[PDB]
Amino acid sequence: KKISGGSVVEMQGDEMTRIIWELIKEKLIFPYVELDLHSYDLGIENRDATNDQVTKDAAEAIKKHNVGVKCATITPDEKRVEEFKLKQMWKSPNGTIRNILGGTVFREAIICKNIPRLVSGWVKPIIIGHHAYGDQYRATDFVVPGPGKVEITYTPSDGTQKVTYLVHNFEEGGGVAMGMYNQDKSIEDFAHSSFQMALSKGWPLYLSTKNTILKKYDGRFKDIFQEIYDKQYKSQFEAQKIWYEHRLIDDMVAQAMKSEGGFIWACKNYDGDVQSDSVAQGYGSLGMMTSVLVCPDGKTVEAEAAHGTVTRHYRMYQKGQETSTNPIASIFAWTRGLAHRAKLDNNKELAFFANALEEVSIETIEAGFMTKDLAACIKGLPNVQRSDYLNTFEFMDKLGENLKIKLAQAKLE
Amino acid sequence: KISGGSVVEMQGDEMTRIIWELIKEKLIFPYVELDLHSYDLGIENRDATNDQVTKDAAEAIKKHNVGVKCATITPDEKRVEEFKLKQMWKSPNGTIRNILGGTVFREAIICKNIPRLVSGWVKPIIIGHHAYGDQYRATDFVVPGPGKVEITYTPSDGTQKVTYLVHNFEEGGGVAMGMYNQDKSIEDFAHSSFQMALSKGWPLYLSTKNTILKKYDGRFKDIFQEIYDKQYKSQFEAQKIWYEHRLIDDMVAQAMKSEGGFIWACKNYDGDVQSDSVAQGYGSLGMMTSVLVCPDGKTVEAEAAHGTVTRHYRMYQKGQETSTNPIASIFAWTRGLAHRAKLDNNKELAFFANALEEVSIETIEAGFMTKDLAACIKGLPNVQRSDYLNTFEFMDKLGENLKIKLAQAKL
Ligand SMILES: NC(=O)c1ccc[n+]([C@@H]2O[C@H](COP(=O)([O-])OP(=O)(O)OC[C@H]3O[C@@H](n4cnc5c(N)ncnc54)[C@H](OP(=O)(O)O)[C@@H]3O)[C@@H](O)[C@H]2O)c1
Ligand SMILES: NC(=O)c1ccc[n+]([C@@H]2O[C@H](COP(=O)([O-])OP(=O)(O)OC[C@H]3O[C@@H](n4cnc5c(N)ncnc54)[C@H](OP(=O)(O)O)[C@@H]3O)[C@@H](O)[C@H]2O)c1
Ligand SMILES: COc1cc(NCc2cc3cc(Cl)ccc3[nH]c2=O)ccc1C#N
Ligand SMILES: COc1cc(NCc2cc3cc(Cl)ccc3[nH]c2=O)ccc1C#N
């Protein structure tokens, strides 16, 4: 009696995450749930094999079936082109997908009692989202060769008066300059995703900006969030004993470091990249970072780990050496995905399993069975020895055993 | 008694004014004679002068080169109606940078008994930002609807103008903005960062997002490699250190797994302590120093990265016990004097500047500190009164330890 899972769009990936991804399906997922799976290999060979079309096709499956679970993919730089002999430097799959689906990406660390956090006292979860990976990806930048006047202009499409804003008047040398933009359409999406992520998770929501300085730019993020909230989300927030409030980023950081957690943060940063966030990097185990892509309708969810393909470990695997790669984030991609499926289907057996799997993963670590990065968090890297951790299979085997027990006992009721 | 020479001083506001005068009295004036050129950068003095006193303070730093600044009230719509201000005056620190050029760094004083966010960080990590980041150089506006936003360059020459597409709003509006940076700003920023790394004896690293802003940030990066290979390259090799560029993604992840011990030039939009996670995670903003350096090498103005500690000031006003950490403020003075000692080559003053930091540190390593610092070790919930000293007790204990340290030197 396997569980009837329903329609899920799976997306296979590259390197160490592919290798693990399979272990998850075989050892933790398929022995218990029969899915109407809709796989899409997005490993770099096949993306190149199809001219990055398989990426676009997965994005459309996700729209239709409302549930995606994606493995980590190689985004090609120059050296990967030469390494796989690619036809061209294909765009990052994650951006391709999120452009098609609209909506917003939220990351969150998985927190275990026996794993130190930067801030002890952070005990309820911190869930942060950025506006389409950041304001930097919508920047038009160039060098100013010599003296002169840089300006920005609005050209009403109808054809009423132009308006010109002097940016700077370079009077005695060169420099650099750039323009940045955001569409209302897009800010509204960010709003709806954030509010609806908050209702779904049950915590309150904070929008941070720098509207002391960017009065009109960050202003209009605030006013849009406020109009949308006051017009269509307040009653449902009140009903969950939660709220939305805008903060100055200055205020918002000071609070969040003096807090216990349990909130949604809509950061209006310039850079949304995980790899440049000091706190995310500071936990000291990127393998405990989940992500989720929520769309402005509330139905459509795509889940995935926030780390990369772990190329450094992958090269060791190929040469047949020990690896201690952390599967958690990838495991939680499946459980968040499956959980949301269950939400849409009103499928209590799936919801139980999903939660169960998340539960066991933390429990397993808390008993003191874990991968090297987590032991390193406990003891310190120079102090870690081989008998403090399990390799990638030993930890996956352990999670299988503990999952068997959990569900076997849990059945008796 | 040790004559220092000329220093420039700007008296501050609220809790920092009180803490200032105590440092002057107990720590500075009994050990050292000075030619204090003092400006009253309290809010109420500025309003009386129509902000002009801030200018005078700044221009005076030009002549003498050493400044020590007490935290100051930067007005706001409630601070206006609090003092009936003639106008909502601008930030003093800004006016002072604006007038001196220069690049503001920020350090956090560390002790062996005060947990850092990362245990492994056992050396200083000094961060500078390019003129407070490019949000203060931004020009924002609302887009009412469908239409084009174009950024254009009209050469002074008169040669053909250039025009890049920012975005064409097809359906509905949004927002737009453009920011700039003159090359001279960047040369200064780089110069300041090369001088700062040379004095503090640590390697340098510049962070950018040149994988997305290939031109804008790339430009920063070259001016850094150019000026390095040109003017400073072999001076580093002489002091056994090095300069390198790091993609911001790479820099952050390298830092957080390092032992500290480097200068960091952050090319950023927001160079405000308030919004820095890592600075607000230490626990005591009372431990965060900040030092303005100029390109020319000659000019240094020190202060505290924390504000005026208003919540503590209101407790001062009512006779209620306060526990305000003065280290940053002490370090404003030691930085100012250790610099003045290198200008004057005044060895006697140099020793005093290093003496007072070692004392400040030793006191806290010994286990005598303020409430913030106690909270970092135990947790604010677990903190008993017996765990820490109040504003006054901590001073007297430093004053005491300063006296004893100075004595043993003579011998
Ligand atoms: N959406 C995505 O799928 C996504 C996101 C980011 C990057 N990537 C791609 O993945 C490839 C590799 O990128 P990268 O090496 O920069 O990033 P990465 O895969 O996150 O690896 C960086 C380092 O972090 C540690 N780490 C990350 N995940 C871990 C895990 N699950 N368990 C244990 N340790 C872990 C490892 O450090 P130690 O080796 O020191 O243990 C690893 O070398 C690139 O082609 C990149 O474009 C993909
Ligand atoms: N250097 C400058 O010129 C500068 C920099 C920032 C702000 N300001 C100005 O000064 C005011 C800032 O006040 P603010 O309350 O916003 O920020 P703040 O005075 O720097 O600090 C606010 C809180 O931080 C803690 N704190 C700061 N310094 C401390 C110390 N030395 N010892 C112990 N705790 C300390 C206190 O927390 P607890 O209350 O929890 O103990 C305090 O309530 C504003 O009017 C602003 O315009 C000036
Ligand atoms: C509950 O523990 C965590 C939660 C996390 N959530 C994600 C996150 C939080 C976050 C919080 C702030 Cl104040 C600033 C930037 C941030 N960036 C992030 O990506 C990350 C790390 C830990 C730790 N330790
Ligand atoms: C030696 O430990 C410290 C040094 C500090 N230096 C100042 C500073 C560091 C810093 C480091 C990063 Cl990775 C990011 C932003 C940062 N902003 C800062 O203002 C601050 C805190 C601690 C701690 N714990």
Side-chain angles (χ1 to χ4, degrees), chain B residues 103-105 125-130 186 189-194 196-197 203-209 220 224 243-248 251 262-268:
Chain B
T103 297
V104 170
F105 286 84
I125 290 172
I126 303 113
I127 268 58
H129 296 247
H130 171 48
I186 312 182
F189 178 35
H191 278 295
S192 311
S193 313
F194 294 116
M196 170 55 54
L204 185 64
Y205 291 111
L206 166 79
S207 92
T208 68
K209 206 75 165 167
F220 272 77
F224 270 79
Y243 165 83
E244 300 195 19
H245 171 272
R246 290 284 190 282
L247 170 74
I248 220 312
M251 193 42 178
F262 52 85
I263 318 291
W264 180 346
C266 204
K267 194 260 129 199
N268 199 349

CSV table of all heavy atoms in Angstrom, one decimal, chain B residues 103-105 125-130 186 189-194 196-197 203-209 220 224 243-248 251 262-268:
chain,number,residue,atom,x,y,z
B,103,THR,N,37.8,58.0,2.6
B,103,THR,CA,37.1,56.7,2.7
B,103,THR,C,37.0,56.2,4.2
B,103,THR,O,38.1,56.0,4.8
B,103,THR,CB,37.8,55.7,1.9
B,103,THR,OG1,37.8,56.1,0.5
B,103,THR,CG2,37.3,54.3,2.0
B,104,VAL,N,35.8,56.0,4.6
B,104,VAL,CA,35.4,55.6,6.0
B,104,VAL,C,35.5,54.1,6.1
B,104,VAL,O,34.7,53.4,5.5
B,104,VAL,CB,34.0,56.0,6.4
B,104,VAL,CG1,33.5,55.4,7.7
B,104,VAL,CG2,33.9,57.6,6.4
B,105,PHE,N,36.4,53.6,6.9
B,105,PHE,CA,36.5,52.2,7.3
B,105,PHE,C,35.8,51.9,8.6
B,105,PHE,O,35.3,52.8,9.3
B,105,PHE,CB,38.0,51.8,7.4
B,105,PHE,CG,38.7,51.7,6.0
B,105,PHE,CD1,39.2,52.8,5.4
B,105,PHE,CD2,38.7,50.5,5.3
B,105,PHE,CE1,39.7,52.7,4.1
B,105,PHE,CE2,39.3,50.3,4.1
B,105,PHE,CZ,39.8,51.5,3.5
B,125,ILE,N,39.1,42.5,11.0
B,125,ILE,CA,38.5,42.6,9.6
B,125,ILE,C,38.0,44.0,9.5
B,125,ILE,O,36.9,44.3,9.9
B,125,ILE,CB,37.4,41.5,9.4
B,125,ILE,CG1,38.0,40.1,9.4
B,125,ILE,CG2,36.6,41.8,8.1
B,125,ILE,CD1,37.0,39.0,9.4
B,126,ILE,N,38.8,44.9,8.8
B,126,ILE,CA,38.4,46.3,8.6
B,126,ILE,C,37.7,46.4,7.2
B,126,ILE,O,38.3,46.0,6.2
B,126,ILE,CB,39.6,47.2,8.7
B,126,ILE,CG1,40.3,47.1,10.1
B,126,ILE,CG2,39.2,48.7,8.6
B,126,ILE,CD1,41.7,46.5,10.0
B,127,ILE,N,36.6,47.0,7.2
B,127,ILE,CA,35.7,47.2,6.0
B,127,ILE,C,35.6,48.6,5.7
B,127,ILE,O,35.3,49.4,6.6
B,127,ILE,CB,34.3,46.6,6.3
B,127,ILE,CG1,34.2,45.2,6.0
B,127,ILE,CG2,33.3,47.3,5.5
B,127,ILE,CD1,35.2,44.3,6.7
B,128,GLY,N,36.0,49.0,4.5
B,128,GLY,CA,35.6,50.3,4.0
B,128,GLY,C,34.6,50.2,2.9
B,128,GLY,O,34.3,49.2,2.3
B,129,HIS,N,33.9,51.3,2.6
B,129,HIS,CA,32.9,51.4,1.5
B,129,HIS,C,33.2,52.7,0.7
B,129,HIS,O,33.7,53.7,1.3
B,129,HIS,CB,31.5,51.5,2.1
B,129,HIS,CG,31.1,50.3,2.9
B,129,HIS,ND1,30.1,49.4,2.5
B,129,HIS,CD2,31.5,49.8,4.1
B,129,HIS,CE1,29.9,48.4,3.4
B,129,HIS,NE2,30.8,48.6,4.3
B,130,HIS,N,32.8,52.7,-0.6
B,130,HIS,CA,33.1,53.8,-1.4
B,130,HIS,C,32.2,54.9,-1.1
B,130,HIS,O,31.0,54.9,-1.6
B,130,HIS,CB,33.1,53.4,-2.9
B,130,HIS,CG,33.2,54.5,-3.9
B,130,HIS,ND1,34.2,55.5,-3.7
B,130,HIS,CD2,32.4,54.9,-4.9
B,130,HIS,CE1,34.0,56.4,-4.7
B,130,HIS,NE2,32.9,56.1,-5.4
B,186,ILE,N,36.9,57.2,-7.4
B,186,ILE,CA,37.4,55.8,-7.3
B,186,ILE,C,38.9,55.7,-7.1
B,186,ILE,O,39.3,54.8,-6.5
B,186,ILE,CB,37.1,55.0,-8.7
B,186,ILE,CG1,35.6,55.2,-9.1
B,186,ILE,CG2,37.4,53.5,-8.5
B,186,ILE,CD1,35.2,54.4,-10.3
B,189,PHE,N,39.2,56.3,-3.5
B,189,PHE,CA,38.8,55.1,-2.8
B,189,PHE,C,39.9,54.0,-2.7
B,189,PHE,O,40.2,53.5,-1.7
B,189,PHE,CB,37.4,54.6,-3.4
B,189,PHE,CG,36.9,53.3,-2.8
B,189,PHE,CD1,37.1,53.0,-1.4
B,189,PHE,CD2,36.3,52.3,-3.5
B,189,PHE,CE1,36.6,51.8,-0.9
B,189,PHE,CE2,35.8,51.2,-3.0
B,189,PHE,CZ,36.0,50.9,-1.6
B,190,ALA,N,40.5,53.8,-3.9
B,190,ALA,CA,41.6,52.9,-4.0
B,190,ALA,C,42.9,53.3,-3.3
B,190,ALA,O,43.5,52.5,-2.5
B,190,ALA,CB,42.0,52.7,-5.5
B,191,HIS,N,43.2,54.6,-3.5
B,191,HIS,CA,44.4,55.2,-2.7
B,191,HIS,C,44.2,55.0,-1.2
B,191,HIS,O,45.0,54.3,-0.5
B,191,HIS,CB,44.6,56.6,-3.1
B,191,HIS,CG,45.3,56.9,-4.4
B,191,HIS,ND1,46.6,56.5,-4.6
B,191,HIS,CD2,44.9,57.5,-5.5
B,191,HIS,CE1,47.0,56.9,-5.8
B,191,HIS,NE2,46.0,57.5,-6.4
B,192,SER,N,43.1,55.5,-0.7
B,192,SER,CA,42.7,55.4,0.7
B,192,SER,C,42.9,53.9,1.2
B,192,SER,O,43.4,53.7,2.3
B,192,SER,CB,41.3,55.9,0.9
B,192,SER,OG,41.2,57.2,0.4
B,193,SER,N,42.4,52.9,0.4
B,193,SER,CA,42.4,51.5,0.8
B,193,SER,C,43.9,50.9,0.7
B,193,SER,O,44.2,50.1,1.5
B,193,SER,CB,41.5,50.6,-0.1
B,193,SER,OG,40.2,51.2,-0.3
B,194,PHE,N,44.7,51.4,-0.2
B,194,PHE,CA,46.1,51.0,-0.2
B,194,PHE,C,46.9,51.6,0.9
B,194,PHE,O,47.7,50.9,1.5
B,194,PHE,CB,46.8,51.3,-1.6
B,194,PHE,CG,46.2,50.5,-2.7
B,194,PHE,CD1,45.5,51.1,-3.8
B,194,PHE,CD2,46.3,49.1,-2.7
B,194,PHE,CE1,45.0,50.3,-4.8
B,194,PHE,CE2,45.8,48.3,-3.7
B,194,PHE,CZ,45.1,48.9,-4.8
B,196,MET,N,45.5,52.6,3.9
B,196,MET,CA,45.0,51.9,5.1
B,196,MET,C,45.5,50.5,5.4
B,196,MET,O,45.8,50.2,6.5
B,196,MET,CB,43.4,51.9,5.0
B,196,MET,CG,42.7,51.0,6.0
B,196,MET,SD,43.0,51.4,7.8
B,196,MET,CE,42.7,53.2,7.8
B,197,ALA,N,45.7,49.7,4.3
B,197,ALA,CA,46.3,48.4,4.4
B,197,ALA,C,47.8,48.5,4.8
B,197,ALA,O,48.3,47.6,5.5
B,197,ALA,CB,46.1,47.6,3.1
B,203,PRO,N,46.8,42.4,4.5
B,203,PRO,CA,46.4,42.3,3.0
B,203,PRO,C,45.1,43.0,2.7
B,203,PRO,O,44.2,43.1,3.5
B,203,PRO,CB,46.3,40.8,2.8
B,203,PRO,CG,46.1,40.2,4.2
B,203,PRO,CD,46.9,41.1,5.1
B,204,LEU,N,44.9,43.4,1.4
B,204,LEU,CA,43.7,44.0,0.9
B,204,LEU,C,43.0,43.1,-0.1
B,204,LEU,O,43.6,42.2,-0.7
B,204,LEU,CB,44.1,45.3,0.2
B,204,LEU,CG,43.0,46.3,-0.3
B,204,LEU,CD1,42.2,46.8,0.8
B,204,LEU,CD2,43.7,47.5,-1.0
B,205,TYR,N,41.7,43.4,-0.3
B,205,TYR,CA,40.8,42.6,-1.1
B,205,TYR,C,39.8,43.6,-1.5
B,205,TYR,O,39.2,44.3,-0.6
B,205,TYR,CB,40.2,41.5,-0.3
B,205,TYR,CG,41.1,40.4,0.1
B,205,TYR,CD1,41.4,40.1,1.4
B,205,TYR,CD2,41.6,39.4,-0.8
B,205,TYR,CE1,42.2,39.1,1.8
B,205,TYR,CE2,42.4,38.4,-0.4
B,205,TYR,CZ,42.7,38.2,0.9
B,205,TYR,OH,43.5,37.1,1.3
B,206,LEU,N,39.4,43.7,-2.8
B,206,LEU,CA,38.3,44.5,-3.3
B,206,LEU,C,37.2,43.6,-3.7
B,206,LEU,O,37.5,42.5,-4.3
B,206,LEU,CB,38.7,45.4,-4.4
B,206,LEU,CG,37.7,46.2,-5.2
B,206,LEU,CD1,37.1,47.3,-4.4
B,206,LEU,CD2,38.2,46.6,-6.5
B,207,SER,N,36.0,43.9,-3.4
B,207,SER,CA,34.9,43.1,-3.8
B,207,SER,C,34.1,43.9,-4.9
B,207,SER,O,34.0,45.1,-4.8
B,207,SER,CB,34.0,42.7,-2.6
B,207,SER,OG,32.9,43.6,-2.3
B,208,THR,N,33.6,43.2,-5.9
B,208,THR,CA,32.7,43.8,-6.9
B,208,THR,C,31.7,42.7,-7.4
B,208,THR,O,31.9,41.5,-7.1
B,208,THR,CB,33.3,44.4,-8.1
B,208,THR,OG1,34.0,43.5,-9.0
B,208,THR,CG2,34.3,45.5,-7.8
B,209,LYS,N,30.7,43.2,-8.1
B,209,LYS,CA,29.9,42.3,-8.9
B,209,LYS,C,30.2,42.4,-10.4
B,209,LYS,O,29.2,42.4,-11.2
B,209,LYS,CB,28.4,42.6,-8.6
B,209,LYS,CG,27.5,41.4,-8.8
B,209,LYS,CD,27.6,40.4,-7.7
B,209,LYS,CE,26.4,39.4,-7.8
B,209,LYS,NZ,26.6,38.2,-6.9
B,220,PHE,N,35.9,49.9,-11.5
B,220,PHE,CA,36.5,50.0,-10.2
B,220,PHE,C,37.7,49.0,-10.1
B,220,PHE,O,38.8,49.5,-9.7
B,220,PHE,CB,35.5,49.5,-9.1
B,220,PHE,CG,34.6,50.6,-8.5
B,220,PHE,CD1,33.6,51.1,-9.3
B,220,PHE,CD2,34.9,51.1,-7.3
B,220,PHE,CE1,32.8,52.1,-8.7
B,220,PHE,CE2,34.1,52.2,-6.7
B,220,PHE,CZ,33.1,52.7,-7.5
B,224,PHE,N,41.8,49.8,-9.5
B,224,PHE,CA,42.5,49.1,-8.4
B,224,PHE,C,43.8,48.4,-8.8
B,224,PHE,O,44.8,48.5,-8.2
B,224,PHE,CB,41.6,48.2,-7.6
B,224,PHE,CG,40.9,48.9,-6.5
B,224,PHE,CD1,39.8,49.7,-6.7
B,224,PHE,CD2,41.4,48.8,-5.2
B,224,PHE,CE1,39.2,50.4,-5.6
B,224,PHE,CE2,40.8,49.4,-4.1
B,224,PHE,CZ,39.7,50.2,-4.3
B,243,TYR,N,47.6,42.5,-2.6
B,243,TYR,CA,46.3,42.9,-3.0
B,243,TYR,C,45.6,42.0,-4.1
B,243,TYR,O,46.3,41.6,-5.0
B,243,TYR,CB,46.3,44.4,-3.6
B,243,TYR,CG,45.0,44.6,-4.3
B,243,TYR,CD1,43.9,45.0,-3.7
B,243,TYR,CD2,44.9,44.3,-5.7
B,243,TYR,CE1,42.7,45.1,-4.4
B,243,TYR,CE2,43.7,44.5,-6.4
B,243,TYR,CZ,42.6,44.9,-5.7
B,243,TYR,OH,41.4,45.1,-6.4
B,244,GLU,N,44.3,41.7,-4.0
B,244,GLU,CA,43.6,40.9,-5.0
B,244,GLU,C,42.2,41.4,-5.1
B,244,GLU,O,41.6,41.9,-4.2
B,244,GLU,CB,43.7,39.4,-4.7
B,244,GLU,CG,45.2,38.9,-4.7
B,244,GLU,CD,45.3,37.3,-4.8
B,244,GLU,OE1,44.3,36.7,-5.2
B,244,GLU,OE2,46.4,36.8,-4.4
B,245,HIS,N,41.6,41.1,-6.3
B,245,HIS,CA,40.2,41.3,-6.5
B,245,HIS,C,39.5,40.0,-6.2
B,245,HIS,O,40.1,39.0,-6.4
B,245,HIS,CB,39.9,41.8,-8.0
B,245,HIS,CG,38.4,41.8,-8.3
B,245,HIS,ND1,37.7,40.7,-8.8
B,245,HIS,CD2,37.5,42.8,-8.3
B,245,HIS,CE1,36.5,41.0,-9.1
B,245,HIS,NE2,36.3,42.3,-8.7
B,246,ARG,N,38.3,40.1,-5.7
B,246,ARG,CA,37.4,39.0,-5.5
B,246,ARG,C,36.0,39.4,-5.9
B,246,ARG,O,35.6,40.5,-5.7
B,246,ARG,CB,37.4,38.6,-4.0
B,246,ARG,CG,38.7,38.0,-3.5
B,246,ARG,CD,38.9,36.5,-4.0
B,246,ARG,NE,40.1,36.0,-3.2
B,246,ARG,CZ,41.4,36.3,-3.5
B,246,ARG,NH1,41.7,37.0,-4.6
B,246,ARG,NH2,42.4,35.8,-2.8
B,247,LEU,N,35.4,38.5,-6.6
B,247,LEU,CA,34.0,38.5,-6.9
B,247,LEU,C,33.4,38.5,-5.5
B,247,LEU,O,33.8,37.8,-4.6
B,247,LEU,CB,33.6,37.3,-7.7
B,247,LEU,CG,32.1,37.1,-7.9
B,247,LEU,CD1,31.5,38.1,-8.9
B,247,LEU,CD2,31.7,35.7,-8.3
B,248,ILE,N,32.3,39.3,-5.4
B,248,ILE,CA,31.6,39.4,-4.1
B,248,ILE,C,31.2,38.0,-3.7
B,248,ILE,O,31.4,37.7,-2.5
B,248,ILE,CB,30.5,40.5,-4.2
B,248,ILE,CG1,30.5,41.3,-2.9
B,248,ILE,CG2,29.2,39.9,-4.6
B,248,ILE,CD1,30.5,40.5,-1.6
B,251,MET,N,34.2,36.5,-2.2
B,251,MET,CA,34.8,37.2,-1.0
B,251,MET,C,34.1,36.9,0.3
B,251,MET,O,34.7,36.5,1.3
B,251,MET,CB,34.7,38.8,-1.2
B,251,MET,CG,35.5,39.6,-0.2
B,251,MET,SD,37.1,38.9,0.1
B,251,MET,CE,37.8,40.1,1.3
B,262,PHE,N,42.4,41.1,7.4
B,262,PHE,CA,42.5,41.7,6.1
B,262,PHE,C,41.6,43.0,6.0
B,262,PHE,O,40.6,43.1,6.7
B,262,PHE,CB,42.1,40.7,5.0
B,262,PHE,CG,40.7,40.0,5.2
B,262,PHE,CD1,39.5,40.7,4.9
B,262,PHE,CD2,40.7,38.8,5.8
B,262,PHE,CE1,38.3,40.0,5.1
B,262,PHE,CE2,39.5,38.1,6.0
B,262,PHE,CZ,38.3,38.8,5.7
B,263,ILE,N,42.0,43.9,5.1
B,263,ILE,CA,41.2,45.0,4.8
B,263,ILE,C,40.3,44.7,3.6
B,263,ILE,O,40.7,43.8,2.8
B,263,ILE,CB,42.1,46.3,4.4
B,263,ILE,CG1,43.3,46.4,5.3
B,263,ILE,CG2,41.2,47.5,4.4
B,263,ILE,CD1,43.0,46.8,6.7
B,264,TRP,N,39.1,45.3,3.6
B,264,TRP,CA,38.1,44.9,2.6
B,264,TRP,C,37.5,46.2,2.1
B,264,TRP,O,37.0,47.0,2.8
B,264,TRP,CB,37.1,44.0,3.3
B,264,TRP,CG,36.0,43.5,2.5
B,264,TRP,CD1,35.5,43.9,1.2
B,264,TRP,CD2,35.0,42.5,2.9
B,264,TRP,NE1,34.4,43.3,0.8
B,264,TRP,CE2,34.1,42.3,1.8
B,264,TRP,CE3,34.9,41.7,4.0
B,264,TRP,CZ2,33.0,41.5,1.9
B,264,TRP,CZ3,33.8,40.8,4.0
B,264,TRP,CH2,32.9,40.7,3.0
B,265,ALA,N,37.7,46.4,0.8
B,265,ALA,CA,37.1,47.5,0.1
B,265,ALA,C,35.8,47.0,-0.5
B,265,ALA,O,35.8,46.2,-1.4
B,265,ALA,CB,38.0,48.0,-1.0
B,266,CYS,N,34.6,47.3,0.1
B,266,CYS,CA,33.3,46.8,-0.4
B,266,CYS,C,32.7,47.8,-1.4
B,266,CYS,O,32.5,49.0,-1.0
B,266,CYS,CB,32.4,46.6,0.8
B,266,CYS,SG,31.0,45.4,0.6
B,267,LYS,N,32.5,47.4,-2.6
B,267,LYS,CA,31.9,48.3,-3.6
B,267,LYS,C,30.4,47.9,-3.5
B,267,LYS,O,30.1,46.8,-3.8
B,267,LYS,CB,32.5,48.1,-5.0
B,267,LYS,CG,32.1,49.3,-6.0
B,267,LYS,CD,31.0,48.9,-6.9
B,267,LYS,CE,29.9,49.9,-6.9
B,267,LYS,NZ,28.6,49.3,-7.5
B,268,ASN,N,29.6,48.8,-3.0
B,268,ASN,CA,28.3,48.4,-2.4
B,268,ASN,C,27.4,49.6,-2.7
B,268,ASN,O,27.8,50.7,-3.1
B,268,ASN,CB,28.5,48.3,-0.9
B,268,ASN,CG,27.3,47.5,-0.3
B,268,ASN,OD1,26.3,47.2,-0.9
B,268,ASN,ND2,27.5,47.1,1.0
